[PDB]
Every structure is written in C-alpha cells, then in structure tokens.
Swiss-Prot record:
It is an enzyme of class 3 (hydrolase). Keywords: Antimicrobial, Bacteriolytic enzyme, Cytolysis, Glycosidase, Host cell lysis by virus, Host cytoplasm, Hydrolase, Viral release from host cell. Changing T26E: Complete loss of activity at neutral pH; covalently bound substrate. SUPFAM superfamilies: Lysozyme-like (SSF53955). Substrate binds at L32, F104, S117, N132. The lineage of its organism: Viruses, Duplodnaviria, Heunggongvirae, Uroviricota, Caudoviricetes. PANTHER family: T4-TYPE LYSOZYME 1-RELATED (PTHR37406:SF1). It is found in: Host cytoplasm. This is Endolysin. Belongs to the glycosyl hydrolase 24 family. Optimum pH is 7.3. The gene is E.
Amino acid sequence: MNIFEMLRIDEGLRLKIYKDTEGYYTIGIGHLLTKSPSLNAAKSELDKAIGRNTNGVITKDEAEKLFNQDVDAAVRGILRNAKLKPVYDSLDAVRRAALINMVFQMGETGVAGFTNSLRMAQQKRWDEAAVNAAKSRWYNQTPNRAKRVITTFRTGTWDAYK
Ligand SMILES: [Cl-]
Ligand SMILES: [Cl-]
C-alpha cells in the first residue's frame, strides 16, 4: 500500500466537476479547482489546468495526471517547509505518508498549525499527539478520514486502510 493508494481512498475519483464537503469546485482526485462560487471560474481553472477545452469533464488519465502533480507538489512543499521538513525527516515511511496525506488535504499552512501534535510526534509520543490532532476542526469536519490518518500516524502501520 502507498500514498497514492491511500489518498485514492480518502479522495475518491470524479471526472465531472463537483463541490466538496466544504462546497468548493473540485474534480478528479481531490483536485481543488477554486474557492469561488463561479462555475465558470471553475471551468476556466479546469481548462487551464488540463490545457484544453474540457467543458468540465475529464478522463481517467487526466485525473491521474492531476493527482501526480498534486502529490509531487505535496512532497515538495513539505521538504521546503521549515516547520515540517525535519518532522518528516524523522518519521518512518508509513507515517510520512500520513503527513503527506494531511498536507495534501489541508495545505502546508493548515498543517503547520498542528504544532502541538507535530512537536509531540517529533518526540515519538504517538498516543499523545494523536489525541491532540483529534481536537481539531479537521477531525470534527471529517472524522472518518481524520481517524484513518491519525491511526496511521500513530501506528506507523496501514491497518486503518485494510
Ligand atoms: Cl495545476
Ligand atoms: Cl470523513
């Protein structure tokens, strides 16, 4: 199992523009298109991302392409963030995946704010940090996902995804 498989489960796969839980235009595999309410803006952003006149519909391959860029972006953003890099560098690979997962979902910014958990995770005190991560809007809005991630994080295993 891996991050690709992992995130493919949390995000799903849609080929036609959709609104997420938060109500934003999105498509593919968790590829946020726009925070704006204009479906056109969304189409525009779509077209601009794909490089063609999509008319809000994409193909599997395109979705996948977005996904790769997005993952690769997440990995890179982590490595370039001073708050995060180190953390990342200390974790094993399973946990890294978890980290990546959250960055993918909430951005380098929204994640940099789990300072308290993160610093705990830095010390390797799993249970502690987990509970703390839970005391969050994140956790409250998308409990099931959040749970899969915090479990993974804490366990360093993939149990929550089988
Ligand atoms: Cl893009
Ligand atoms: Cl959820």
